[PDB]
Design a protein around this ligand. Structure first.
Ligand SMILES: [Mg+2]
Ligand SMILES: [Mg+2]
Ligand SMILES: [Mg+2]
Ligand SMILES: [Mg+2]
Ligand SMILES: [Mg+2]
Ligand SMILES: [Mg+2]
Ligand SMILES: [Mg+2]
Ligand SMILES: [Mg+2]
Ligand SMILES: [Mg+2]
Ligand SMILES: [Mg+2]
Ligand SMILES: [Mg+2]
Ligand SMILES: [Mg+2]
Ligand SMILES: [Mg+2]
Ligand SMILES: [Mg+2]
Ligand SMILES: [Mg+2]
Ligand SMILES: [Mg+2]
Ligand SMILES: [Mg+2]
Ligand SMILES: [Mg+2]
Ligand SMILES: [Mg+2]
Ligand SMILES: [Mg+2]
Ligand SMILES: [Mg+2]
Ligand SMILES: [Mg+2]
Ligand SMILES: [Mg+2]
Ligand SMILES: [Mg+2]
Ligand SMILES: [Mg+2]
Ligand SMILES: [Mg+2]
Ligand SMILES: [Mg+2]
Ligand SMILES: [Zn+2]
Lengths: 66, 177, 136, 115, 94
RNA sequence: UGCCUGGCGGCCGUAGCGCGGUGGUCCCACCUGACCCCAUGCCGAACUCAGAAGUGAAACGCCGUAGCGCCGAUGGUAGUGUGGGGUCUCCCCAUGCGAGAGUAGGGAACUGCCAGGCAU
RNA sequence: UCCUCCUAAAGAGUAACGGAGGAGCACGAAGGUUGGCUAAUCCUGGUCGGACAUCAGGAGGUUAGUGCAAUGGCAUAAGCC
RNA sequence: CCGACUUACCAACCCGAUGCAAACUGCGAAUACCGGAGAAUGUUAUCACGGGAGACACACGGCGGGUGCUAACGUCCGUC
């Protein structure tokens, strides 16, 4: 790689909210604070909700009962 | 090199077991990662592409190549030689570091992220993807943004089929729906 | 009136009409009309023959025209002198040599195909004959 | 990959064949290296040296280095001098004139090959 | 079985072929297998009244040359451009 | 003396495509790393250097297969040089030259020099 | 007035108020040398992005390109840096 | 939005078959042209230089073609 055309590329630490501290090589200079990493993400964990959740019948039977 | 070590330790075993491979060379490997930014608005201003080059170099520590037009096109009011895009190629330690940083930080940070499609291997095992926003990368400060300009990533691998590419990405723990 | 939709050049030379033909054997239908003489066929004679045979067979069956006018014959205007350039293209002509089949027909009885091709021969200038397909 | 090297060397080989001069062809490999002098007709070889030969390989640590390239150049130059070959042309055979090829050429020049 | 009687061509060429065709005959060639090709002469009417059958180009042909039987099969034929006549027939020894 | 491999050639498809197998002692290729010699319009991708942990997967070399390409008869046809003719904007005769296309068929190259490994 | 093809009858040449097109320039680099490289087109996948800008592969093999009109050539490239 | 369909119609690429082209050749003659050797023959019939001209309005027929109506004892090119 060429010497003086590329930006400075140093190591840094990115502390996550959940505590999954990681060390990666970047160019930001200062340390990083992260909100959602690859461990505390709902999709990665597997807890992803949906939209349908039944429909009209359950609501009707729970609101109006003969 | 963390992802390279993780691959060489606990990916070749899984791929060989699930594909009945005879040699380690049969195991697919990630040849390269190329990032592209097709800024089709550089005609009005050259700085609009010079800032895109800086935004693309802030993500990966390489000065981007200012690609040009292969031929003149009238539907886009361009002529041959006009620079309209930025390209970056990553192979080796920087490629692995960018892959790890992407999958660990940038992919979860995407707004309304609900996984990634598994039908973008173009029938050859090389995986294409595209983002609609760049500030998901933590190397960009919100107060210093000029415009929002996305990019498209392509992972070129030695795999011969979409099944093998998807298996390699799953072993690398890539977001799949 | 058969005519090419485009051509590289508008006017061509005269050439000659020496030699025999290549499309001698019937290869598409069952019966055919084969020229015996040597001459020229325009885009109007072939159309008239096609109309005559269509009326003869009452539009039943299928027919094939294996010839096509591609030679731009030209004629100079009336009362003009010589030279001053080449004339203006007027009609198109297909060169015909002995042995060339002009029309082919299938799905028609032979006794009706004979008269259907006789009607076409009666309007075509060159002499023709009735032939049938053969096994190699 | 190997075809691009032949395409690069084709022009030089054709020029040397047209000139009709003795041609010293070198071949580069990460493991070994070869060199040989060839008559202008191109179908007759006179002398040749290589690191695969044990008589010269029993002196070098690694066959793929500039030291081995210089040793091969010296061996081929001394083997051509006894036959009386001094006015010879060089052929990179598609390889860049850098590193092992340059070392071999310099060794030949020092050993007394005029090119 | 279609049986034909043939001759042997002493002279070849365009002139010989045209003489044969004007003398109510026509040349033909028999080839195939591993033997030398044979150039024969055939009567015109006796073959024109035989080739009109579809069996002529599918079945076997028994040719008599020099008082011997040869089993051939029709392989190629050349017909007159604008006349119901024949000019040359290529047989395969089979 | 054979087998395999590398380089330089001879001829330029009967020499090339495609399918299926085989090859790692040596050679070769893939391959490891890179402050250095050297370089990328960015990137040891290419060039180049320092090496041999591992693999013959890819490429490469070899083997057989006629799904292609390719070569190609004999005879016949068209054409044509010369001399004669006819029903002459086209043909025929006498004597020489003799196509192209197509068919039968052939065909999964041959060979020279210099080197390396294994048997002799 | 000059250049390309045909007519021009397989050496050259060969006419008409014949059939089709061009020129009266340009470049200190668009020249020389050295070093390196090979496309037109189509298919698949990918953010704005659409039939077609840019990026990855695959098919294809000069069907592109020549500073210009046409012809003859160009892979050792005469083409592209 | 997305579309589910067939339908008096036309039709791209490719494949199979049939043709045509002076400005189309992956094919390719016969003739003609260059050069060499050889026997025979021809009043050197060959070339170079010098003196002197004449002529540059051609026509017809055969073969090979353009323009004409594949008309002209029509016109324009090559050979005899
Ligand atoms: Mg002609
Ligand atoms: Mg004759
Ligand atoms: Mg090994
Ligand atoms: Mg390497
Ligand atoms: Mg292999
Ligand atoms: Mg013949
Ligand atoms: Mg004559
Ligand atoms: Mg032939
Ligand atoms: Mg043939
Ligand atoms: Mg093979
Ligand atoms: Mg000429
Ligand atoms: Mg001539
Ligand atoms: Mg130039
Ligand atoms: Mg060059
Ligand atoms: Mg696109
Ligand atoms: Mg041009
Ligand atoms: Mg140049
Ligand atoms: Mg022609
Ligand atoms: Mg002579
Ligand atoms: Mg005068
Ligand atoms: Mg005059
Ligand atoms: Mg005259
Ligand atoms: Mg006159
Ligand atoms: Mg005439
Ligand atoms: Mg006249
Ligand atoms: Mg008179
Ligand atoms: Mg006059
Ligand atoms: Zn977290």
């Amino acid at each position: 790689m060429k010497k003086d055309i590329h930006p400075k590329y140093e190591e840094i630490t990115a502390s996550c909210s959940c505590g999954n501290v990681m060390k990666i090589r970047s160019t930001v200079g200062h340390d990083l604070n992260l909100d959602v990493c690859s461990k505390c993400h709902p999709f990665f964990t597997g807890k992803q909700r949906d939209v349908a959740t039944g429909g009209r019948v359950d609501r009707f039977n729970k609101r109006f009962n003969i | 090199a963390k992802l390279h070590d993780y691959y060489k330790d606990e990916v070749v075993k899984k791929l060989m077991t699930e594909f009945n491979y005879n040699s380690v060379m049969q195991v697919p490997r990630v040849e390269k990662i190329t990032l592209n930014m097709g800024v089709g608005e550089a005609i009005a201003d050259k700085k609009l592409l010079d800032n895109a080059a800086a935004d693309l170099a802030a993500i990966s520590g390489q000065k981007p190549l200012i690609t040009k037009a292969r031929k003149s096109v009238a539907g886009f009011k361009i002529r041959q030689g006009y620079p309209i895009g930025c390209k970056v190629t990553l192979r080796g330690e920087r490629m692995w570091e960018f892959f790890e940083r992407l999958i660990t930080i940038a992919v979860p940070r995407i707004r309304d992220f609900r996984g990634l499609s598994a039908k973008s291997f173009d029938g050859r095992g090389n995986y294409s993807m595209g983002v609609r926003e760049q500030i998901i990368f933590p190397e960009i400060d919100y107060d210093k943004v000029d415009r929002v300009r996305g990019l498209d990533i392509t992972i070129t691998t030695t795999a011969k089929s979409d099944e093998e590419g998807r298996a390699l990405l799953a072993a690398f723990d890539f977001p799949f729906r | 009136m058969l005519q090419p939709k485009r051509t590289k050049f508008r006017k061509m030379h005269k050439g000659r009409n020496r030699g025999l033909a290549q499309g001698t054997d019937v290869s598409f239908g069952s019966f055919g009309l084969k020229a015996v003489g040597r001459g020229r066929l325009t885009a109007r004679q072939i159309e008239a023959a096609r109309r005559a045979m269509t009326r003869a067979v009452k539009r039943q069956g299928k027919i094939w025209i294996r010839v096509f006018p591609d030679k731009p014959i030209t004629e100079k205007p009336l009362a003009v002198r010589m030279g001053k350039g080449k004339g203006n293209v007027e009609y198109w002509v297909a060169l015909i040599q002995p042995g060339k089949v002009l029309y082919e027909m299938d799905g028609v009885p032979e006794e009706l195909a004979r008269e259907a091709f006789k009607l076409a021969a009666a309007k075509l200038p060159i002499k023709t004959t009735f032939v049938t397909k053969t096994v190699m | 990959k190997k075809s691009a090297r032949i395409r690069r060397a084709t022009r030089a080989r054709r020029k040397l064949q047209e000139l009709g001069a003795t041609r010293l062809v070198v071949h580069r490999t990460p493991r070994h290296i070869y060199a040989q002098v060839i008559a202008p007709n191109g179908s007759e070889v006179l002398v040749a040296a290589s690191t695969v030969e044990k008589a010269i390989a029993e002196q070098l640590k690694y066959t793929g280095n500039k030291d081995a390239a210089a040793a091969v150049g010296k061996a081929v130059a001394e083997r051509a001098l006894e036959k009386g070959i001094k006015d010879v042309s060089f052929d990179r055979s598609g390889f860049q004139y850098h590193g092992r090829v340059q070392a071999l050429a310099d060794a030949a020049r020092e050993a007394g090959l005029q090119f | 079985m279609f049986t034909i009687n043939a001759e042997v061509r002493k002279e070849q060429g365009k002139g010989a072929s045209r003489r044969l065709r004007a003398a109510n005959k026509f040349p033909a060639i028999i080839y195939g297998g591993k033997e030398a090709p044979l150039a024969i002469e055939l009567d015109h009417d006796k073959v024109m009244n035989m080739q009109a059958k579809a069996e002529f180009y599918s079945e076997v042909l028994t040719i008599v040359v020099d008082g011997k039987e040869i089993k051939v099969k029709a392989q190629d034929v050349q017909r007159h451009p604008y006349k119901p006549k024949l000019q040359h027939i290529d047989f395969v020894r089979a």
